[PDB]
Design a protein around this nucleic acid. Structure first.
Ligand SMILES: [Mg+2]
Ligand SMILES: [Mg+2]
Ligand SMILES: [Mg+2]
Ligand SMILES: [Mg+2]
Ligand SMILES: [Mg+2]
Ligand SMILES: [Mg+2]
Ligand SMILES: [Mg+2]
Ligand SMILES: [Mg+2]
Ligand SMILES: [Mg+2]
Ligand SMILES: [Mg+2]
Ligand SMILES: [Mg+2]
Ligand SMILES: [Mg+2]
Ligand SMILES: [Mg+2]
Ligand SMILES: [Mg+2]
Ligand SMILES: [Mg+2]
Ligand SMILES: [Mg+2]
Lengths: 203, 205, 144, 100, 51
RNA sequence: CUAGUAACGGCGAGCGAACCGGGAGCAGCCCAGCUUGAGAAUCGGGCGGCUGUGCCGUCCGAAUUGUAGUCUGGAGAGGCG
RNA sequence: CGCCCCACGAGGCGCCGUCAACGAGUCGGGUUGUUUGGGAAUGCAGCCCAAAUCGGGCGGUAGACUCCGUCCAAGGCUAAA
RNA sequence: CCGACUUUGUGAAAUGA
């Protein structure tokens, strides 16, 4: 039982052991390309719990993403409108950077399907997410009873559409009661359902 | 606006004509659902068409607490005390609901009574032809089973209106029920101050 | 029914019934309740006194179930008693009625009662209702 | 607990129905600390060390200023409920270090 | 161009009548047939019908 | 249906859901973890054979930074019947 | 309708009391923008703060305490309507 | 333009506690 030991070791993220081993990795990462194939998870126990396996076809990609919000890309900062949509620089994006990393890897890696992603490193400029992807064509993945669900055609570009673990968080689906009822089935499906003027036959 | 009228409140400022929902497919909905039910019945011949069994439960919510209705499944405690295993109740057409809680013997015994009646009037075909194992039923019993239709156990929604006639005792007449009703409203209002005054007796006294 | 619509009778009269001098333009008074405090003021303060302003304290997440108390006056109770169990009675024996079996919670007290004793059994009652029932000789049982 | 009063208003109001005592369920022990996980967390506590706010709380307790220790623990952790119990755990870790 | 106020599918194609008023109407439809004079006045050829 | 209601709003114009209840349909599941260590029991690819959506024999390889197996909180692991 | 007969392995049921592990820059907090009916802040997002295991989230007014009811997140799949 | 937090580590003295 090593994964529990390494789990608390990675829980104590302000201890000096993680401060060291994590700053040196931050340098190494900052010196490599944005999207890079890594042959082993750096956080094997985090990957286990999110469905990584030491089995062929599960690949791990380190995607570097930048930090900070979204500044409105207009011709100078000149927004034609009323004073209430006339701001530029304090707006925040509506997808977490974890999902942005998954959806960068989704565009780079055409043939493979994103499964999950987990935080590994960060600094003032960047965050680093290690994204578990699956090759849906190799026989070792086609013959696993537990992960066929990803080879059915309704699962193309999950991350491009909001269906992974990080996707649901920004979709508002971590939550069940009120406080989260408008986000099921989706906020736009709720909006349509609530706007339909139902005119019955014998109204 | 103009002459005395109720103040207008039409919610017709968005693009509502893009979302008008007209119901002209309503009869076809009915016919489609009917065909769906008919073919489900044909596939599940000779299981009852009502599907699996359900519990008598009370509704929530003061408005409806006094009205019984159908539930989602018998709790593990009923399924255990009826001799009907957890894993096997959905197999023999009894729902199971792991989430409910039983707080009253009355509810628990009522749902046991439904389980016992169902197990009395349930017939189960053998998994194979000649091999009749435990829980099955006799060939001559099986030969007369049909597809029971509709609600083969109706749940009476509320207790029947009986208005009987009894003595008017003087120990009944003397009871001041309005004063009673006001006194415990006092008890509820004062429960704060009374327990404060009490607790300070321990603190100081 | 188009054949009854009075516009069909205004065919041939140039103005279609909205005047020559002052015409029928689009919205000469604003869209809807506009000008409540400005020019429709006379209207809103003559025919709708009390429209403008805040009164009373907010109640977050009101559930209408918690405010639910269907009432019955005393005058209605004997209708609840079928004739044959009205006859199965004497001077001293009275029918026992549980109103909750009828869907009422409170038993208010408007109206007459006969001399006949009646034993109502309710979840709430008022002053006057019990006074009328006792004065009729019947009694009260509180339940829930 | 004991049944309702049976009268529609008042302290413990409602309808009398005979109450039943619910046998324990899993997730009634949810989070009951266990021998091995206490082992695991102990060991990595010692191997990793203390965070800087944890060390500052140790210092405020080894001086004895428990109000300030709570105050900084709150400003870090976020809520009174967690701040008080992080202070409680650092008092534990400091008594168990002065014990020898 | 268009037509003025183009017709829309959400006109009131179906109308409702009280169920008891349908029952009243069908009873008074029956009650009128039992009359040879109104069956005739409605246009049917009834001159050899026995009763 | 709740409900143009609670709410929200230069509390102005306006905006506006939810629990309860009635119906339609109803179905639950599987992983990571402590748990083969007398023994990787797992998977893939090449080649060959057949009964060909696969199965078998052999070689190479992946995998001990853990594949498979038990377990998923309603439990469960054990011992007993 | 016929030939093949299902076990010492798994499950169920009952007894036990000893175990009984449950997902981390994740929740939570501050602040900022947007969003909402969500109002001392409904969601979401950035930044900074940054966890717990007699423990965590809720009970629609911010707060401390006592009790109560409730559920167990941060991994995944799932027809019908 | 400016301050604070952040990437941001290592150790030395002088004044303040
Ligand atoms: Mg614009
Ligand atoms: Mg428009
Ligand atoms: Mg004229
Ligand atoms: Mg003319
Ligand atoms: Mg006119
Ligand atoms: Mg004109
Ligand atoms: Mg003139
Ligand atoms: Mg005019
Ligand atoms: Mg003029
Ligand atoms: Mg003016
Ligand atoms: Mg045309
Ligand atoms: Mg209404
Ligand atoms: Mg937006
Ligand atoms: Mg907000
Ligand atoms: Mg804000
Ligand atoms: Mg899904």
């Amino acid at each position: 039982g090593a994964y529990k030991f390494v789990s608390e070791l990675w829980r104590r993220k302000q201890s000096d052991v993680m401060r060291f081993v994590q700053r040196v990795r931050c340098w190494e990462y900052r010196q490599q390309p944005a999207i890079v194939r890594i042959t082993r998870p750096t956080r094997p126990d985090r990957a286990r719990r999110l469905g990584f396996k030491a089995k062929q076809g599960y690949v791990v990609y380190r995607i570097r993403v930048r930090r900070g919000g979204r500044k409105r890309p207009v011709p100078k900062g000149i927004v034609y409108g009323k004073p209430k949509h006339q701001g530029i620089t304090q707006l925040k994006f509506q997808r977490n950077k974890r999902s942005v990393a998954e959806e960068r890897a989704g565009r780079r890696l055409g043939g493979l399907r994103v499964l999950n992603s987990y935080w590994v490193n960060e600094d003032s400029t960047y965050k680093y997410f290690e994204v578990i992807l699956v090759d849906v064509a190799h026989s070792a993945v086609r013959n696993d009873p537990r992960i066929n669900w990803l080879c059915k055609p309704v699962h193309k570009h999950r991350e491009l559409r909001g269906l992974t673990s990080a996707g649901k968080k920004f979709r508002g689906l971590r939550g069940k009661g009120h406080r989260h009822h408008k986000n099921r089935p989706s906020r736009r499906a709720t909006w349509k359902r609530n706007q339909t003027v139902s005119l019955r036959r014998y109204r | 606006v103009k002459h005395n009228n109720v103040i207008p409140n039409g919610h017709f400022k968005k693009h509502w004509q893009n979302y008008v929902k007209t119901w002209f497919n309503q009869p076809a909905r009915k016919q489609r659902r009917r065909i769906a039910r008919q073919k489900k019945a044909v596939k599940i011949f000779p299981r009852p068409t009502s599907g699996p069994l359900r519990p008598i439960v009370q509704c929530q919510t003061r408005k409806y607490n006094m009205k019984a209705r159908a539930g989602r499944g018998f709790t593990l405690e009923e399924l255990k005390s009826a001799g009907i295993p957890k894993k096997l109740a959905p197999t023999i057409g009894i729902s199971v609901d792991h989430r409910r809680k039983n707080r009253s013997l009355e509810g628990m015994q009522s749902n046991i009574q439904r389980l016992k009646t169902y197990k009395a009037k349930l017939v189960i075909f053998p998994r194979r032809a000649r091999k009749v194992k435990a829980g099955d039923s006799t060939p001559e019993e099986l030969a007369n089973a049909t597809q029971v239709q509709g609600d083969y156990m109706p749940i009476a929604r509320g207790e029947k209106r009986s208005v009987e006639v009894v003595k008017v005792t003087e120990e009944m007449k003397e009871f001041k029920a309005y004063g009673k009703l006001r006194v415990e409203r006092m008890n509820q209002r004062q429960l704060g101050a009374r327990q404060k005054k009490a607790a300070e007796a321990e603190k100081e006294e | 029914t188009t054949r009854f619509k009075k516009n069909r009778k205004k065919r041939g009269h140039v103005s279609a019934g909205h005047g020559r001098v002052g015409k029928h333009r689009k919205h000469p008074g604003g869209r809807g309740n506009a000008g409540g405090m400005h020019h429709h003021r006379i209207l809103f303060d003559k025919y709708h006194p009390g429209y403008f302003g805040k009164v009373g304290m907010r109640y977050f997440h009101k559930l209408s179930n918690r405010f639910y108390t269907p009432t019955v006056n005393v005058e209605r109770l004997w209708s609840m008693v079928p004739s044959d169990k009205a006859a199965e009675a004497g001077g001293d024996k009275a029918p026992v009625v549980d109103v909750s079996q009828f869907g009422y919670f409170k038993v208010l007290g408007k109206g007459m009662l006969p001399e006949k004793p009646i034993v109502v059994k309710a979840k709430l009652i008022s002053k006057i209702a019990e006074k009328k029932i006792k004065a009729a000789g019947g009694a009260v049982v509180l339940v829930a | 607990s004991q049944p309702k009063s049976g009268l529609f208003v008042g302290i413990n109001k409602g309808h009398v129905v005979t109450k039943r005592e619910l046998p324990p369920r899993p997730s009634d022990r949810k989070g009951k600390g266990t021998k091995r996980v206490h082992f695991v967390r102990n060991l990595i506590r010692e191997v990793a060390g203390f965070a800087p706010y944890e060390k500052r709380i140790t210092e405020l307790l080894k001086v004895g200023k428990d109000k300030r220790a709570l105050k900084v623990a709150k400003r870090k952790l976020g809520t009174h409920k967690r701040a008080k119990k992080k202070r409680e755990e650092m008092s534990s870790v400091l008594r168990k270090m002065r014990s020898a | 161009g268009r037509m003025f106020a183009p017709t829309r599918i959400w006109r009131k194609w179906h109308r409702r009548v009280n169920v008891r008023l349908r029952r009243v109407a069908v009873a008074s439809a029956l009650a009128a047939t039992a009359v040879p004079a109104i069956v005739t006045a409605r246009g049917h050829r009834i001159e050899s019908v026995p009763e």
